[model samples]
Target: AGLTYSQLMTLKDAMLQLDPNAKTWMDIEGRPEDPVEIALYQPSSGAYIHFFREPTDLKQFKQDAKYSHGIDVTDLFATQPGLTSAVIDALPRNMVITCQGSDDIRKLLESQGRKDIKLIDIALSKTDSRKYENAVWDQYKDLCHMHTGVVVEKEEITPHCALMDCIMFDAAVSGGLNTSVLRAVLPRDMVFRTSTPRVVL
Candidate 1:
């Protein structure tokens, strides 16, 4: 079934609380499924899924605020759509190249940009990105324990909507890159979250 105006507005309200600049777009390309839909299920089984134009856009929302908004990106890191080239380099190497082709890249591409913005290109290859992911998982367990007094040991980060933002933010910090820089450099989301089986990132 398609979304009703009221439901769209409801999701939009939740989205804006997370991102002031957030906006929505319709899928006219006739693609089967969208990976950018961050879902939160209701008691009646209806779900609120925010459709973002790209993965970076979703990542931006996930990185925005952990207290209330943003999706957790922990499990996504190992998925096809999860790690953008820049994200891969940043998480594993601790630094990465700047973005290209978008308005967001203009700052880093400017003449005095890097130094002016304090965005560094020098990467530190000290640890694997998986370590950061593991840390997020640890935090997730701790959160579940504190909230419900029951430890939920599942690996999925998306289902924990209330804690997803916190997980992503914590992972970003653990990776040593500023969330702003990460957002500015991440590549756009590609094909389908609904994809060819066996193709994992």
Candidate 2:
């Protein structure tokens, strides 16, 4: 059966609530204006999961409001139909992607160039973007909490949609597979780390 969008929302909400840093609290220097700083659920598109670093998250990182509207990255993948997952999986670790705006809208790749756009590198190149994923199971009680933030985000920040953006970008890079194919890739979703010694500085 096709999952109702709400089921997906449940999963997204589950993911977002995994971190202790996810909620709204004014216990920092910036005192978080928008407590949760995430895209709320949409009956049409579901939820846009946002994650940020704290004690002050969204307040610490802000960008032009227009950049959020600049592109619907999934379309970038749509434009490259002939490409295959094997080709993308084989891409160089140094390969780069700058989020250019819509085809009709005017924008310069040079002006908008960003180096941190490395989803393929993270996905194919040794990585663990799901830092919060490993500890998620133990936090099952925390995950079940039904919650929302009172503060509202006027614009998206690095922490806003950045992590999910990378996750989605990897999916886009790997070919937008159907349910069966997606299931095969699920095991690679997260890794269980026993201790912190292996982490990079």
Candidate 3:
């Protein structure tokens, strides 16, 4: 059997108590050391997940308000049909590219007018770092060389959503998948820091 709703909620609450950052912390105070309230368990959705929020309390302090919720499976089932379809579609599209070199990929994206895609080139060690840098620079140069309207974005300054945007774009480019349409479909509490590198994608 699948996880019951109550079980999911209890698990979510315990997880949040253990690590508030698991939920979105809004109303941040001075530093990371400051105590922050987490927004978990969206009553309306009746799910264990919570989205990120500021450190302030909405009931007592009334300073920090609940802005957005994390993406949960319930949300996906309810709202994100497009994203769900895209993810399912991505399985066959081979959008996941192992960063071999940057120029060829850049040229492909430019030709496709997908310059807005954000690039997160992860280099595990120093040697790999240098290699990635050179390849990335070469790709950048090619983008300049072609004068293509596409804008190449590096991961350093890119926002979380920006990365997601790129993935969604790639999905669409490959097979007309639109994952962004599912943003509202996911549960607000479902996403946490630990969920990174695997869950979010």
Candidate 4:
């Protein structure tokens, strides 16, 4: 039988509470996987992708007021024709579709006569990067030297670089490749640096 909306909500809650880090997946007819299940289904239509290296980057874009006027349509129409798709189809003729992808993709869309869909790269400018660098340094100035033997001081670590390093550090620890004294200084919640538990997995 098909799941009721209420039951589906309950199931989602149960699954998340049991495994908070569960990767999201959807199945045909909303049924659990079993031996009789059909092969995994995917839309034949072209797919959409983000330039974001991590989910947190998307989160930051949503929260930042700089791009507040644009729609946060990241996962809303996941199967829409854009970026990875060669041709744009089934999209509104001229709506302001704000997204981020490669320069080539932007040019490709323009080449295909796409005018309303604007590609915006979500990255910190040098000014914003400096601000983030200073903020990161201020919070973790005392904790930087513990990881590397060399002592480095304020503005020495770029927030973006620190973020990448910490992600690799998490992978190493989680996969049993290595251990470390400090995981990351960049907070998982970009808005507040004190949210702690920087490691997502």
Candidate 5:
């Protein structure tokens, strides 16, 4: 009833084949200054499947260095603690996690025909109207805590503003009030911008 060690090895091998450039601490020699350990298991079968010990450190390593390390939050809904109880638990038992690109995420949501899920792009820049900038900053703040990453360069986009305006106009025409509001939120200061690029989701 549980997956075998060979099966797991085959899976890891397939992943490596798909992404040959993938490297862990073990892949390099005499690079990192600390030891690294990786453990694999089959929780259901109580099997200690695989163990890897590498003489490399992850203290300053990039989080996105490995394919599995850069997991999409959308894909890990079931495993994430607080979030697992909410939207993930409501999904159908047979639902599968689909890997999607940025554009694909938008397309999939649109195809679902649900008005509940909303997407809006706000431009934040010094040159923009102060009101708009404030709004954008507020939203950015909320995203900082709820999401990840650092705020680097902010810019204004006419096209993005036009798109948001159109969405707002449509919502108004359909008597649908836009519930998306802006708020000031912040992430932990310890998470530096230079260290993580994929922090913003």
Candidate 6:
């Protein structure tokens, strides 16, 4: 993370140029306010997480290729002993665990000792998720930019940065910050997906 002052200044200027609301969370990094949420189609004790309907639900997702030969974690979480009370508290009442706080539990267990206590990873399956995907991402990735007319270099697209920017765009548009322009570039097929009209309180 090293940078000379000149480099830091250039990065600062670039952030300002890229985002109008850049100052709001300028100091973020290292100090994480929210943990990342990740969906796993194929999971491993070593990888990503998502909400599950049951503590043991993740085992249902196929194990990651390497761990395909390891213990089936399907019933591992619910069946494992000495799982910390804190880890248990971070979990949902009866859904697959959310990815958001699973790591605090995991890191705790690893730091404290995996056999003593820990949270298991999370995942989603066809039985749990209704979300569908299309192969439109590559062609439309640049549409997520502040200026959709410009193309973003594929290598320059950071996953977390793009995700945060997308959420900001959605929140702002929902609040009427930018509409006609946003609506102009929205995925036509996705335009009427799940939104409902506003109603009086």
Q: Could you say which candidate leads in TM-score?
A: 1
Residues 1-201, candidate 6, lDDT per residue (tens digit)?
233455334434432222221211110111122211112211111111121111222433223212211122332233212212222232223223223235543453344334333233333342222121111233234432211121223222222222232323223323422222221211221222233345579
RMSD for each model, in Å, please? 16.5, 19.3, 19.5, 19.6, 18.5, 19.7
What local lDDT score does residue 64 receive in model 6, on the 0 to 100 scale?
Answer: 23
What would the per-residue lDDT of candidate 4 be over residues 126-146, giving only the tens digit for each residue?
Answer: 343243334444444454221
Q: What TM-score quantifies how close candidate 6 is to the native fold?
A: 0.22
**Model 3 CA deviation exceeding 4 Å by range:** 1-157, 160-166, 172-180, 183-186, 189-201
What's the C-alpha lDDT at position 8 in model 5?
37
- TM-score versus the correct structure, for each prediction: 0.26, 0.20, 0.18, 0.21, 0.20, 0.22
Error of 5 at 153 (Å): 5.2
- In the range 1-201, model 5's lDDT, one tens digit per residue, is 222455434434433222112111111111122212121111122222111122223443223223112222332222212211122122223322211112332343334443243333232232332334334434333332212222122332221121122223323333443445422111211112123345565
Span of 10 residues, lowest total lDDT, candidate 5: 22-31
Candidate 3 local lDDT, residue 30: 14
Output the better candidate (3/4) by TM-score: 4
* Segments in model 5 whose C-alpha atoms lie over 4 Å from true places: 1-102, 106-133, 139-149, 153-201
32-102, model 3: which lDDT tens digit per residue? Answer: 22112111121122222212223222343222111211112222222211221121121212132222233
Superposition error at 136 for model 1 (Å): 1.5
Local distance difference test values of all predictions, in order = 0.28, 0.24, 0.26, 0.27, 0.25, 0.26
Candidate 2: tens digits of C-alpha lDDT, residues 1-201: 222355344434454332222221111111123221111111112222222212223323222122331222222221212111221222223333322111211111112342222311223322333343223223322321212212234543222133233333333433441121111111111111121243477
Clashing pairs in 4: none
Candidate 1 per-residue C-alpha lDDT over 1-201 given as tens digits, one digit per residue, 9 for 90 to 100: 233455344433443322212221111100112233221112111121222223344434343323222334442333334222221111212122221112322232232223232222222232432234444544444322212112232222223232233233334434542222111111122212342354478
Which candidate, 2 or 4, has the higher lDDT? 4
Off by over 4 Å in 1: 21-127, 141-201
- Worst 10-residue stretch by lDDT in candidate 1? 23-32
Instruction: Judge candidate 6 against the unseen true structure and give its global Cα lDDT, from 0 to 1.
Output: 0.26
